Curated annotation (Swiss-Prot), chain A:
NCBIfam families: sulP. Belongs to the SLC26A/SulP transporter (TC 2.A.53) family. The chain crosses the membrane at residues 71-91, 94-114, 119-139, 153-173, 175-195, 235-255, 320-340, 352-372, 389-409, 447-467. Coiled coil: none annotated. The gene is SLC26A3. It is a multi-pass membrane protein. This is Chloride anion exchanger.
Length: 702, 701
């Protein structure tokens, strides 16, 4: 088990010379733009098949293996989607039939343009809250009781159409990779804070209080105050009914997930609780007996198409962008959990296209934005969902409820809908345990979690997310801000070089320093790098050059005065103990000391580490070779190359050899584009490894 | 030359077990806290001296070598600072004597608390514009000579708040924020701000009346207001402004060319202003041509003022922006002289000194200002040795504020605008950085171009915040799609290079070496997974799922008795298997990702060999996967999770995974993530690629 090697020492250049390099063509932007306009027959066919996924998965349908499972799954998820749409239309502060429209239209569009097979398309609590806040802001900023709700419905439809336009545009430009800009901890903190938001927003329905339409910042607190400032007017029937429902659903949901095997299908508890609530509310006339708030009479049928208010568009651009980013992020996360679980490809740009088209059509037909709820997508999948025919059947049941049997949902209290929303909220509320976990594993991701939570609670849900994404990008700088730069040493008289402070019996070759920065070097850390390198070598190369240039100036002054003589032997001092007189260079003359020392005029070389005559004193250095382990240095920006070029020039002007090792070919190619190399700084400073550079130095010195 | 090495094959664990690792106690935050509160006698002396730097440099003043120089640089700079203060008070839209106040108080405070020895402290055009925009916004957002009074009051409160912010940042020791602004961000921001200032001086060259426009797009609103009324331009002012701008430009270049030959820079600003003031007074331009003049200034200082909290509330964000810019600019100018003259520079003390100076200035009715490069270059180029030149400049400003200010009464505002425009060449010619950055680095060209657009459209304050955010986003752009590669041995030695870059390369059979040349985190973890799967040629989870399907079918036959188990092979008594798949339900399909435990069966199943009864499983050739993590600087929670998941699916399909090239700190952090367990172990870490390859070869032989 021996590592035995016997090869020649290699500079990066000697390796390129000895081993001829496979010539590869340039992947030019112009020829790439040439493939863009392919106009090929099969290319156009695959483009059209990628824009219309139903044309590819519907003919490949397995009837005897999928049909009945999709029927059952669709029945269940549609019965869940009706109630979720009503509750989320409560969250948006519009009549509850618009939640039915939001549960109908996007599902029917995603049936045609969607690439997923397991998500339930429709509204979810976080997006209904965001849409309601955007609508309150729009009605606030609009230039001058049913009229108020009509204005809110129009503003919701317009916010939805603009969100869908933004999503469809992001999918057309093929930017479906923006979901990578939200980490797991950012999403965790955001969804926990948003679950708290949705909890607080359902309190005006549990207690049945009149809360104004607060806007951000701090709307959760404005809302908490409004609720508890009047906690004396709380309806007791509403609170009791909401409590009992929450208790039952919670227990059964547990029973459901605890006993998944014994149950052929999960127990529909939201449906059963809704039927029982409506029955005991209609039979006992709770509306009159206990003055409870009910869903009321809904208009049977759909609304005519609406035209989006450009005024609302102007007043809600930022909100609509946020509604679009959160919608895509949530839908893509869920969709990705089932693509992976069931092993089929999920196009992100087609996700954006389908969701944008669905939101556009929904908003045109008086709906509000929605992409997918993790709780409803779970029901469809757990009930046997195989394709998006389950989504079609859920939309058919929502249609049946809209057109035919909506009057049954008339005596249903809104406290029951709020209680269902809270029962679904517990799952996101249980994410508070991630704080301690991240604290132990990565404090930067713990910081992302805590700061996302605080930004989302204090600021809005839309400004909170934007602020949260920015801080998460800042933590990437925090990581690579103060790298643990170290000095290496050989260990084992072999080619292993490790931290000089870590092991015993290590060995530093006389005059050689090996410095390692374990991070990419850019604008935020080039100064820290230069300072740690100066601490490692033990001196400042520039200070040395200036002092040598000053000394050399004094030498030339004393020698052209005749006070000392130049000889191939060296400096001959007929006069000793010279008068000390600093030149005291002025501001416009002082720059001369940073110039390379050109003593070629002198007959003999000057050993700057030896004794200079006539009381001249310069700091002496033992360093004659500096190796820079650039192996873990990923990239270098323009600020870093400038700083690096400067550092290297200074070491070279004080006659210290510099070596960069451990780098890959792409790294060196990029440096050539920065105009880094020149007469003083050459490509010969690059060596394959540390041992290569060290051996090259030992042979030079010996 | 010969690289000759003979050592054992080392896994990271083995190397550590054969080499005594110095036991080093890490410094916990708790301890850091203690040394922090040491209260050592010598410690206190250091702190107080650090906060009052004058107690160190003044006692060491070389009189014979610095006094005359300091005097000359002081009189010259002070003469420049008077005019710059008047002009920048025009930029704030307040009476101009307040510019004199702004040029007197921060210099005097920085003389005591400052660490720079060359920077001139006072207002500069970009900060005066930022302060002006803030006050216009504050006056608009206020629940109800007067206009002048209201503007002056707002300029003082914005200054006090930005100074307080500066003082706060210096006390909390956050003086390293200047690293969050790159060279290209600063370049684009400063040339965009030079365009802003160019546009702002147009109402003074032409002598037009332009409203107090606010951002966004205030530069365009101003341009419209100006050229819409362009026909009302006062020709005398324009000719004057053009004459003053032309002459100064030529003389300045002469000063930069015949620099060393010249004993002292030629003071064109003073000479021109004196001639301009003279000819305007003698010929009575105010009446003869109705030119706009500086006018009479009350000959003294104003009484102290209490800052307005309403203004504070209404301008907090603007003050934050003003504070960062003043510090970023002052530190940058100071740094050039600290590196040029080799003295240390403390940013925290700068923020404190710049904070205190601004507070005293806003308290005494001035507006915010750190330093102007032009005035500092004037201070350093004229022999400025210590901050005594700043003291003498402030003394000249004092003299102008109390006795001779009346001489600056007949001076036109077009002359002040022409000087402020002449000081714009350096920042305006930074448009040449676009082509350079295009050649070198297109991410930095993107940073520059975007900062310029944001600054022009959103304004100086908001343009900078969006610019810093985009600057941070480019870091993600650079590492989002790393060029991952497959490596191969070239030379039959320990050199492993890109497989597609050379000829005669060798890949050990069954072995794959994969390199991701960047840190792996949330933004690129999915890309790493996709590229690893494209490189190995298959999805390990799919192979595991099909193996689990095949094993389920094999067991189904075994239970039936059709397939009889024998320690030699999979003998089948009946070869009449009918096509049938289990078709697992949604709640049962996850059993296919579990580890394969065939201990029940007597004989091992070669999943890469043919199975009984025509069971088809994709056969893989990979047995060893090496991951070259040398260029992987850090991981985050998202990536460690993705990595763990990847390694588990390769281990479950019997592919040994090796991670090579990592330092000891990398394996230490990974331990904190709970990455290692029964399946994924630390024995997967080796020292280098060649160590892993030799281990693989001996294992396989």
């Amino acid at each position: 088990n021996q590592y035995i090697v016997a090869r020649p020492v290699y500079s990066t250049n000697a390796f390129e010379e000895n081993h001829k390099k496979t010539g590869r063509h340039h992947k030019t932007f112009l020829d790439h733009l040439k493939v863009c306009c392919s106009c090929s027959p099969q290319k156009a066919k695959r483009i059209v098949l990628s824009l219309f996924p139903i044309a590819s998965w519907l003919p490949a349908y397995r009837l005897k293996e999928w049909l009945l499972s999709d029927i059952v799954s669709g029945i269940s998820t549609g019965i869940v989607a009706v109630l979720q749409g009503l509750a989320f239309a409560l969250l948006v502060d519009i009549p509850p039939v618009y939640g039915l429209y939001a549960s109908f239209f996007p599902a029917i569009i995603y049936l045609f343009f969607g690439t997923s097979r397991h998500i339930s398309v429709g509204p979810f609590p976080i997006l209904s809250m965001m849409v309601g806040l955007a609508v309150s802001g729009a009605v606030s900023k609009a230039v001058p009781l049913l009229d108020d709700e009509r204005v809110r419905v129009a503003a919701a439809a317009s916010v939805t159409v603009l969100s869908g336009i933004i999503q469809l545009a992001f999918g057309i430009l093929r930017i479906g990779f923006v979901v990578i800009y939200l980490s797991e901890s950012l999403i965790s903190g955001f969804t926990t804070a948003a679950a708290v938001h949705v909890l607080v927003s359902q309190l005006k329905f549990i207690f049945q209080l009149t809360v104004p339409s607060h806007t951000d910042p701090v709307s959760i607190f404005k809302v908490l105050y409004s609720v508890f400032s009047q906690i004396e007017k709380t309806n007791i029937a509403d609170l009791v009914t909401a409590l009992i429902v929450l208790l039952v659903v919670s227990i059964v949901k547990e029973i459901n997930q605890r006993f998944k095997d014994k149950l052929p299908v999960p127990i529909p508890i939201e449906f059963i609780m809704t039927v029982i609530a409506a029955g005991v509310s209609y039979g006992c006339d709770f509306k009159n007996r206990f003055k409870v708030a009910v869903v009321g009479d809904m208009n049977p049928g759909f609304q005519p198409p609406i035209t989006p208010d450009v005024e609302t568009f102007q007043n809600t651009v930022g909100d609509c962008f946020g509604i679009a980013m959160v919608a895509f992020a949530v839908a893509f996360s869920v969709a990705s959990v089932y693509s992976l679980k069931y092993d089929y490809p999920l196009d992100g740009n087609q996700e954006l296209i389908a969701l944008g088209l669905g939101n556009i059509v929904c908003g045109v037909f008086r709906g509000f934005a929605g992409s997918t709820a993790l709780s409803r997508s779970a029901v469809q999948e757990s009930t046997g969902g195989k394709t998006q025919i389950a989504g079609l059947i859920g939309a058919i049941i929502v249609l049946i409820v809209v057109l035919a049997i909506g009057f049954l949902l008339a005596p249903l209290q809104k406290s029951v809908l709020a209680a269902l929303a809270l029962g679904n909220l517990k799952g996101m509320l249980m994410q508070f345990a991630e704080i301690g976990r991240l604290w132990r594993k990565d404090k930067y991701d713990c910081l992302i979690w805590i700061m996302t939570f605080i930004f989302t609670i204090v600021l809005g849900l839309g400004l909170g997310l934007a602020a949260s994404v920015a801080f998460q990008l800042l933590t990437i700088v925090f990581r690579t801000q103060f790298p643990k730069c170290s000095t290496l040493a050989n260990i084992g008289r072999t080619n292993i070089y490790k931290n000089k402070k870590d092991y015993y019996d290590m060995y530093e070759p006389e005059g050689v320093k090996i410095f390692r920065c374990p991070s990419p070097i850019y604008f935020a850390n080039i100064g820290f790098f230069r300072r740690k390198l100066i601490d490692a070598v033990g001196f400042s190369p520039l200070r040395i050059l200036r002092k040598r240039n000053k000394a050399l100036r004094k030498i030339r002054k004393l020698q052209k005065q005749g006070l000392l003589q130049v000889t191939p032997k060296g400096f001959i001092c007929t006069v000793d103990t010279i008068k000390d007189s600093d030149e005291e260079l002025d501001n416009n003359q002082i720059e001369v000391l940073d110039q390379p020392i050109n003593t070629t005029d002198l007959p003999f070389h000057i050993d700057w580490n030896d004794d200079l005559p006539l009381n001249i004193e310069v700091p002496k250095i033992s360093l004659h070779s500096l190796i820079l382990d650039f192996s873990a240095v990923s990239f270098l920006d323009v600020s870093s190359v400038r700083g690096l070029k400067s550092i290297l020039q200074e070491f070279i002007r004080i006659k210290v050899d510099v070596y960069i090792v451990g780098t890959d070919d792409d790294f060196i190619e990029k440096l050539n584009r920065y105009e880094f190399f020149d007469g003083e700084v050459k490509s010969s400073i690059f060596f394959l490894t540390i041992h290569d550079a060290v051996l090259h130095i030992l042979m030079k010195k010996d």
